[PDB]
């Protein structure tokens, strides 16, 4: 309907897109790298979300350049997803807002 | 990198009894742990997968148990066909590391061995070549001594002895005594004897052929 | 279906280098990888390096020289390992695997015997070893095939094209004079010889070559 | 009141199986957790695994052969654990616990003494044990009961219905014949027996047996 909530729909489709190719080039990137942990991936995937949504436990971490590079991607895509959430849901109740007051 | 320490090198058990193989890492790496079977002359086989967890096809009397350090993997009633080098294999830190292994034998029954000598054949004749082959099958203890006589007289040149390794079908051991001899050489003799010693009785076991 | 299909043996003159086959079968995915292994007569397992073939990328053991090259064909799902200028040191069974990405290695090829010498390859002679005429039989009777005068190793001794497994003992072979020996012995119920065929199967991979042996016996 | 409730014994042949019960009173909470403990006669403690009866999943110690199997009923607050196909080697005393999901085990059930074994159930021969006419007392008296020729462990010795303790000693049963033997005394003093009676209490368990037989002095 609406712009917010189709942005909204997007990011989050957009998102499970990063997250997948994240692990996917997150474990290309830490194999060949004595001591990287991030190398397998059923965990790769879940430090993607752990990543996405920053809580970010210290389980599982990058240790090269471009699994970092992978990393802030990941992070970024995130916090612009969630964010993009709360600016359609402020939308929303700011319409609401404005019919209430009968504006 | 990863050090997976596997001892003892060797586990001797009695037929039944349940056995545990032992692999510790350098440092902790959860239960990302795996093992393989490798029986004598076969490729490996996965067993357990993160530390206990089963697989499709494999016996149920193999698990395996542990996290952080020290792993092992257990069977529980050993059997014949356990008989093989076994190894652990970490996935918790790049680059991959191996065990060193560890052999599992059986200590079973003493059993005399079966005693087969072997005249040489037409066709490695027709070659002016001439084997004389002995063979000491399924005996155990594994500690046996062969002896080749000619006509009475013990002979010890042109004698090359070969031991397999403890049969995964019945614990037992078996030995091959070849004694090649030029076809000229077989020729100026008459009767050739296989003798085996073994632990299972105070007289050898003998066997002999006449040439003629 | 076997999934990894290795060539059994390579006889490569020190000095020179040899391109290892790995072709593999079953579920193929964008996250698998191929791992080789390398295993010296009677020591352990050691790990080579590891490829994956959808973006074909190698990684390799930094705790040993160097002398391994990973590729991959996408198109005949096929990795391939080049070894070079190799020395005795490098004579052993190198293994392909294959690991899903997570970590555990869930099949295993049969391994090809890489044997690093200058001598030449040699067939071997196949000869039936039946009881002589004074022999005594029991309930059993004990027949068996001599392999000798063949190079590189290994061989595959078989008996009735595989169907006949139970009461058979191949012994390790002896080398000398740069050639190898060994026997293979089976055991029948003697009631079943000579009234039901005993013949054993020889294959020397390292000379394509794949002979029988009837054992019959004694005239 | 008891939280958790166990019968005393099981007598098992070797190769079949038992089901062990563990009755629940006092506060349950869906946040509970039973859980199995074996101890083997003179050995630590073992832990065999737990169940969460709120919604019936069970865990198993990896570290032993599995012979358990554990389950639950809500209804009858009562928790299960069958062991199957047991030996010698599983023969103990089989505890059950309560966790409120925070770690440590703050009640625990008697114990269930379970014996592997071929032998046949026996309940147990009581005879008294008085001192003779020549026997010359003191300020205290010392009386006994002799509890012979039973099958299997344990018993339960209680003198006047557990309100005489003080001055008690029941000595560890020895197996001889398949039968067990043991003995339990007690001192009071002098001046109150015959006076102030007194009788030994003998459960046995796997026989569901309890006699009672009251010390008199000797005719
Ligand atoms: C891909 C799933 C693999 C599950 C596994 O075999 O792996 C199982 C593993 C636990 O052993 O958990 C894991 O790493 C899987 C973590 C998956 C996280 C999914 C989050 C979805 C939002
Ligand atoms: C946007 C960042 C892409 C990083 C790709 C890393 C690939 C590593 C290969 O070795």
Partial sequence: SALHWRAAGAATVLLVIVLLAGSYLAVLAERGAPGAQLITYPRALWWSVETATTVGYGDLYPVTLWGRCVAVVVMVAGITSFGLVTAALATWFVGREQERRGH | ?212 | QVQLQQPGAELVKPGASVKLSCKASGYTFTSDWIHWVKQRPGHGLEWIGEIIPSYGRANYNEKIQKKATLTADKSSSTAFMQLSSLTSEDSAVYYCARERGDGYFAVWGAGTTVTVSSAKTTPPSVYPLAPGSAAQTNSMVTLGCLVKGYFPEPVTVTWNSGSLSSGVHTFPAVLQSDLYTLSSSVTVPSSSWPSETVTCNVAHPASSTKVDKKIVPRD
């Fill in chain 2, 1 to 212: 990198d990863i050090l997976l320490t596997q001892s003892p090198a060797i586990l001797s058990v009695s037929p039944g009894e349940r056995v545990s193989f032992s692999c510790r890492a350098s440092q902790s790496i959860g239960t990302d742990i795996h093992w393989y079977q490798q029986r004598t002359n076969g490729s490996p086989r996965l067993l357990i997968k993160y530390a206990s967890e089963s697989i499709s096809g494999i016996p149920s009397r193999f698990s395996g148990s542990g996290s952080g350090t020290d792993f092992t993997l257990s069977i529980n009633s050993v059997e014949s066909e356990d008989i093989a080098n076994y190894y652990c294999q970490q996935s918790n830190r790049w680059p991959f590391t191996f065990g060193s292994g560890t052999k599992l034998e059986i200590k079973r029954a003493d059993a005399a061995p079966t005693v087969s000598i072997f005249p040489p054949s037409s066709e490695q004749l027709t070659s002016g070549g001439a084997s004389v082959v002995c063979f000491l099958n399924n005996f155990y203890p594994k500690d046996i001594n062969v002896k080749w006589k000619i006509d009475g007289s013990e002979r010890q040149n042109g004698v090359l002895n070969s031991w397999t390794d403890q049969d995964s079908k019945d614990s037992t051991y078996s030995m091959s005594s070849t004694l090649t001899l030029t076809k000229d050489e077989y020729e100026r003799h008459n009767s050739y004897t296989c003798e085996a010693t073994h632990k299972t009785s105070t007289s050898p076991i003998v066997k002999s052929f006449n040439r003629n």
